[PDB]
Design a protein around this ligand. Sequence first.
Ligand SMILES: [Ca+2]
Ligand SMILES: [Ca+2]
Lengths: 569, 569
Amino acid sequence: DMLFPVDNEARQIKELNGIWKFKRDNYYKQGFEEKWFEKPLEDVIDMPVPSSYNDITTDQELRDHVGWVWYERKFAVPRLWKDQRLVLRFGSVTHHAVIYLNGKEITRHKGGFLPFEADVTEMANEGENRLTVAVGNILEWDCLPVGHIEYMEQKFDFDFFNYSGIHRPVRLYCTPKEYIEDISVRTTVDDKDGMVHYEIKTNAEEKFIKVYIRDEKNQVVAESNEMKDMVLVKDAQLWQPGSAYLYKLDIYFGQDHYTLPFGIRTIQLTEKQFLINGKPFYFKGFGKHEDSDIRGKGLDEALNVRDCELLKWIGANSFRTSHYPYAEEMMQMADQKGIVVIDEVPAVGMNFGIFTEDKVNEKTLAYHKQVLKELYQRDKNHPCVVMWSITNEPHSSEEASRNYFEEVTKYIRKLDSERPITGTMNVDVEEDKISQFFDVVCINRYFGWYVGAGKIERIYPSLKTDLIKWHEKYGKPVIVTEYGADTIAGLHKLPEVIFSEEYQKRCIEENNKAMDECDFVIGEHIWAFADFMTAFGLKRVDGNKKGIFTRERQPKTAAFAIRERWRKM
Amino acid sequence: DMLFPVDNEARQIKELNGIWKFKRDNYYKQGFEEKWFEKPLEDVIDMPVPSSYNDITTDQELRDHVGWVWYERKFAVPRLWKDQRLVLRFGSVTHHAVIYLNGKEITRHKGGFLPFEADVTEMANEGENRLTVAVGNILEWDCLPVGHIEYMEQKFDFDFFNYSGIHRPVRLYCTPKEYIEDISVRTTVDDKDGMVHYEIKTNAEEKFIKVYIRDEKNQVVAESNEMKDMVLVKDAQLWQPGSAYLYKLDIYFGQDHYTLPFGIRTIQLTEKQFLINGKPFYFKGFGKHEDSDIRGKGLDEALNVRDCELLKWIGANSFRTSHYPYAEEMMQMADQKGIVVIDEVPAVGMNFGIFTEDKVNEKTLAYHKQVLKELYQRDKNHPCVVMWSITNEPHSSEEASRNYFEEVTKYIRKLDSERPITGTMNVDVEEDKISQFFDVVCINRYFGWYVGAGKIERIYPSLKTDLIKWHEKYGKPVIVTEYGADTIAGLHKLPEVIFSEEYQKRCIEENNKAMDECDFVIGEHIWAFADFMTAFGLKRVDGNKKGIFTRERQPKTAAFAIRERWRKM
Ligand SMILES: [Ca+2]
Ligand SMILES: [Ca+2]
């Protein structure tokens, strides 16, 4: 159960963000061994929430910390909340969490990009309470993303910096004691009329319920007293790429009230095309990252609006939540703005034998299924999500990866029968062993950068040849999910050279020429949207510089050429 | 009454931030004349709150908008708030506001940097309500900051971009119907003993009250049943620069409860020293701004923590709120971190005859006193505030300005008899006509930049001479409140040139040599803390580049030489 918290006459949200008190372990698990949670934290600094902690201070030891840190603040339960159900919700804690309330452990969570909560109805006191949160950043072979510890040094083979902290809002909220627990909505369209199938779960299934479907002007277009039903919406306003329309499932249950936005739209994959509402859709966009200056991966809604303005300005129609689920506020924004989304779990870093019993094994596999279940439960009702990505660049040349990903793909297909399934490729087409389980083949190709760096004339023939091989081996439509080139803003050269602004434009141009000659390509996603931070390395100039925009969300030269192309499509 | 809202067993806060709907006027006052507030806004975009609106979109017409824009969202009143007093608070609206609730005007406000509120107990409905806010950015001769309209173009003489929007949190909060309205605290010290003078004002003064003073471990150290009292704090932990201690005035009144943090510390001025708790204090720090990428002047608490970390790293002990009051969050942070603050009113831009019947006149004067009253009411109880600055660089060579600022200084002295009063100078010392009214003389001087650009060897003789003149004319201690040089990060040259990193360092050094030879100098504030945005001009390379740090809060070369000086001082 993970309905996004709401405010109305019956439910209320208390934000617990702001400035917390903060302290890091000075040796491994110092805070657990010394039971720091038993009393208020001492010798602390201020830390903002939501935000990563790595980039806030001037202290390299905190930036490079491996292990656990400790957050604490106080919150109040109002007298007016006397007989309500009380829930403490964490949008995320990266990567591992132990939650304490007034010195007592109340829940734990594993995985840094999905929300979790704890019912504290019978444990919070009226008035002041103390909330203590332990935050661990260690990744092992059974975490997603994958990593491992060497002797303590953290190892991993994904790009982005392993930021840690409380990256999403913390919320204490209240509901009545009999209440709506979960909602699932599915839609179909028969010519001009839409059919809304819904299922509502409550903790008193025998009690009366009233369910409205309201349109965008909030007028009732359908009505029912069933917990599960199938209601017709005549002349349905469809949710379309670039023109969102959102209905509302408005539910009254006893004293409870919940309103759920949703969209009516169909997805159908053909030979060679990706149909949305029966019309072909060509992905134009980026894989993104949750990353900006100072705050690391902290949610920043102002930055989120600026990014959507940028996506609109440049003619993009989609993005992929590259390498982990994003904040729901961004998923909600994509629903409202009509932006098409590929939603991805953090199965990244399964690459360098990786699929062995001592590394990525059945323990990893079972956790991977759990993350997919948690992702599906959070995002199942978003019309913006049109496809699930279950992995980014696994070492899928290994024979052992075949049974691994057949199992993951079949699990996600049972949870959701309506949305296509995918995963992104980096191994050579001849050696790949899993893409036959997918509905769409997604490839990350860096011709002109990681292959034949600087050789502009080799980009077009190399990509076209590889594209044709992927189509011929699997017979499915293809998206190029990553391609591009590192580019230092202000570095100009004539003739162009790698890292120059001119080279990034030409590299992308030549890849685009290959894709334009292939009738089976259904998308191009440039890597990356914006410069972002990476673990330190000699190929990373203060992070990954493949951004079309700088980290401060201003365009490099190539942005203007991309805009001309995407806007005339 | 402007007590900062609090959460406890009796009072509750609902934040109304997030993503609002937004639309600008297409001609002057269009929304007022078409009565847009009467129905939900149509043809809208998303706009984050808190944030400026100017740097969010890709649209030049909005960035440079002159006039009014319109914000709207919905909010809920829960059933559980049924019998409470309901208050809508705006931390600020820049510059002018008209607030509508369910299509009816409920308040207005002039002034972009101080909070205001509206009692909505009788007008808000249970459940859903519609909040509409018109936001105007026009500055006239009786506004602060000062500006004027020409033919529609906005003119002004201050040097920072005229960002507009809802820069600080919007809060709906509840209290009991009989409640604590205002609190004032003054402190004296007697050897090791504090005396806390307090005065509590309520909604029903004949009822009984309980007042505790609590230390930082929450332990009662004094107690009383009076609304107005002095209570002794023996072995009182003093609030010290760089080592803060905050007691809490904990007040119970009927069903109401309010806890006010405060500090015990004294201020005294001699003709050469600024004494805090009897010890000389030398100001080391910066005038700042509320400015960052994307969000303009929007509150960003993660940015505030990073700034305070950088102030600590560089050995700064103070800042001035150039040129307007900052968010209360930043004032609380200064209270907790032991940072000393010069608190400044937005009386900036009274420069180019300025003090004439048609420009800065009796209306400007009366408004100037009003903003000082409002600033005092908000910040009176902050130990971090050691001095009020009533103006920045007025054209105080005009004879007419004498009576103007005698009025202003008399007025603020009536509100606050303990804190020193000042205002910053740019006119020639021989021409000034007001600084005799101040307790400390503050001068903005840019020898090596605006006077004798590039002539390093003339900086030290020029500032020493000017300093001695200011001291000779007024016989008061002197703070140099601004000095420095524009500096493009990455610009290096040997020998150094203006705009280079090396020149900024040498220019500050030579100015510091002059100050080190003047015993009556009690502070040095470099301009600026961080690069910030200005109105467009040929001297402003994408804004003001006098930052010691970049706009993204990283140090230029001069930061490390400043740190060496300030950390060994
Ligand atoms: Ca969230
Ligand atoms: Ca505020």
